[PDB]
Point group: C4
Chain length 250, copies 4
């Protein structure tokens, strides 16, 4: 009973908090809730499919406030499951943390939402997605790998930037008179930035033997430069996972 | 004779089943059969080259039913080559497997095809390609590598998703009045999704100093994010092959 | 004298053949010769800059025949520098090799060129570039790495192909009536092939809530698939160089 | 006092020179200075936002000359902090170095700037960015990794070049009569170069069953080739960082 009380409350604290194998499905269903809320709002903006989504958004929005408020109250009530928190001093200081402050704030503000309307709704819908990473796991991992590869990321971005400036200047001089697309150094930088990242919208391209002959050399070099950090961080991630797996192997 | 009987039937079971060096050419020729069937159907849809491909499709389609039905009957008759199957109980339970059920089903349904016409033909032509992976080798390998890299794939897709939402919102506010392309948050999400994946169709691009100045920062960051998992899985594959080769080295 | 004779002839054989540090500059200058020949022909096709390049192409073309014929005669005369070739039997059998046959053939045919005109010139200009890899070093290395990664390349291309077929079919059904771009399954395959490779010409894009909602899921998945083998072979190359460097370290 | 003199002057030499943890913020603020100068010039070219940036560019330009001249004088005065330089002979020979020559030259020339106007300003603004890498760290690291991967970079670029030539020739023959886009071998090379790098502006695409059927094979092969070196250098960087970290681990 009361023994089941303590064991239950602890279990609740662990599912709501760090889950290992089974509570993750629960979190996945809450995430699918907020996700469909986001997609339905995106649908609800365009006035051709407006009336066919408002009512659904009302019901699902309230269901979001329901489940999040219930989660939060359990986040507080089930705080004394670890050694630290208990009574009112440990719980009080716990809510003083940054996450629980910002959480309770946004919860009340959401009630104000159901109380700059659609725009602020877009804002809150963005914010609820950040809730899905409580412990800051993704951010912490990304920052780790980026830091260890600081010098190589910087050489990739620095030399890529030099190549963008030089290529855009040269193609500017080559086609300024002949081509309408290039008229300012602003447009030559736009083309160069949207060509070395391999997007290539297609609205500005060299149209001169001088322009095409210059872009032909600088694409082969620059495109690789601007695609380096995707590869450096990719192989950084993969190597780190291999090392961690080895240490599991001991 | 009968000794050659057992040795033959076993050999048939191994070529039709897991081949090592020589039967793989046989499978490659059956695959080229179904492949040219698929390409010829793709040609046969456009009514300018219609009559010049129907007869070929008829002959080649029947040849497909011929060779697949013959393969399947040998798949059953040559099942008793391993220790398990023999007589009628091991063979019976073997056909109870999922693959042989779905195979025999689709074989009879194909006979019904030669008995929603062209559309269902497109459907079956898709399905026969899935037949080319009997043991589920490709799927099994891909699932292995993805699982071991679960945390890094999720951080790549999660942070990329945050960058897509924020960049699309900001560029929306920046160019909503000035640019026709952006009119709803649906179009800002479309541009953002088709720009950070570096496709860049070119139908929606920022056309404002505010828009271009915002997209210029967010491409440099986001494009890398959306191109991470290609690199993480790439180096995951390559590392796994190096480890397996080492263990061959012992 | 004659001692200098043998030492010279051997040296010639080594520079014309496998060079290590100093003859490579010589080969680089011959390559720049043929390269500028190729670029000048590309210029010479367009009839606005026709007369300003014909004479240069004549002089440089003959200089190419000069240096290549001289190289080839030394390739034969200096064959007896290793242990095998000497006199007339070793030299005779050496010219029987495939490379020297095709080389002498193309040399005489080039003289026939100076004796389907511009088109065949395009053909020969392509061929002379293949001459730049005598020992087949690049091809041999590429084939090595591809073979060791056979299984992962095949899973990347196979699953990417499945994703292309399924995505193109679905977007076809979604926008066939609404969008002009998609009219046949041939055009849906064209869009799908030119979208998952992240080229994105921009001439065919989904223009329907159903189309865009289907393409939005399948790009995130497929684009990674079609960009896998670039990454798998990239990390295969890099790993192989690290191993070879280690064995230099012993 | 004088002891504080020597300790100070040495400290100045180390912050202006190789900084470790704290002076790097100082350098970051000087870099943000020159960066905003570059962006403001890019704004100042377009005559719609001309008058709203000239005065800012004047003030910030002079501030650049102020801080750089002050840095340089301290670069000389604080040269005797290491063992070598002192008095007038070590300092004299130090300024004889290439960097300090080019630095003092560009400093005086900048004063001449405040004394081909806007174009030369674009030129100097480019040059000041190269100042941000004094020790040539980025260039040295990039050259290291490229050299160790010389053979694989060359096979990637060589075989990619062969694929570009062959694909452009074939698609030329396939669509020369039917498609306006392709009219010369120059345009077929332009399309091929701007398609295998996955830019895809969209101004030249095959529009013929023969053209599309040829491009469909060659994209799958070539696109990977032209995206190899980004991946090879990516995994080269990542591997080198793992080795260096291990040797820190000893
Ligand atoms: O938790 C919430 N937002 C949040 C924001 C930032 C961070 Cl860092 N963590 C969490 C939240 C809960 C219920 C609700 F209706 C709305 C928002
Ligand atoms: O085997 C066949 N389809 C299949 C489908 C799914 C799975 Cl998982 N395995 C196999 C098949 C054989 C002959 C034929 F005419 C048509 C289809
Ligand atoms: O060597 C030549 N072509 C070649 C072709 C294929 C292979 Cl595999 N190796 C070499 C060559 C030499 C002189 C010349 F004028 C024209 C061609
Ligand atoms: O140092 C400067 N330029 C430079 C150029 C090339 C190299 Cl390699 N190193 C440095 C510099 C200092 C003050 C100034 F107002 C303008 C330029």
């Amino acid at each position: 009973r009361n023994a089941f009380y303590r064991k239950l409350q602890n279990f609740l604290y662990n599912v709501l908090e760090r889950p290992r194998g089974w509570a993750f499905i629960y979190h996945a269903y809450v995430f699918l809730l907020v996700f469909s809320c986001l997609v339905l709002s995106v649908f609800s903006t365009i006035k051709e499919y407006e009336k066919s989504s408002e009512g659904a958004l009302y019901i699902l929005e309230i269901v979001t406030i329901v489940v999040f408020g219930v989660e939060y109250f359990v986040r507080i009530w089930a705080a004394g499951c670890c050694c630290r928190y208990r009574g009112w001093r440990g719980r009080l200081k716990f809510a003083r943390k940054p996450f629980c402050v910002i959480d309770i704030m946004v919860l009340i503000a959401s009630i104000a939402v159901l109380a700059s309307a659609l725009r602020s709704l877009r804002f809150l819908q963005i914010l609820r997605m950040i809730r899905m990473d409580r412990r800051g796991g993704t951010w912490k991992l990304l920052g780790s790998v980026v830091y260890a590869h600081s010098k190589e990321l910087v050489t990739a971005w620095y030399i890529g930037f030099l190549c963008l400036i030089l290529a855009s200047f040269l193609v500017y001089l080559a086609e300024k008179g002949e081509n309408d697309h290039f008229d300012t150094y602003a447009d030559a930088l736009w083309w160069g930035l949207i060509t070395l990242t391999t997007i290539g919208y297609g609205d500005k391209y060299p149209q001169t033997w001088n322009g095409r002959l210059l872009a032909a050399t600088f694409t082969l070099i620059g495109v690789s430069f601007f695609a380096l950090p995707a590869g450096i961080l990719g192989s950084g991630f993969a190597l780190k996972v291999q090392e961690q797996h080895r240490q599991k192997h001991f």
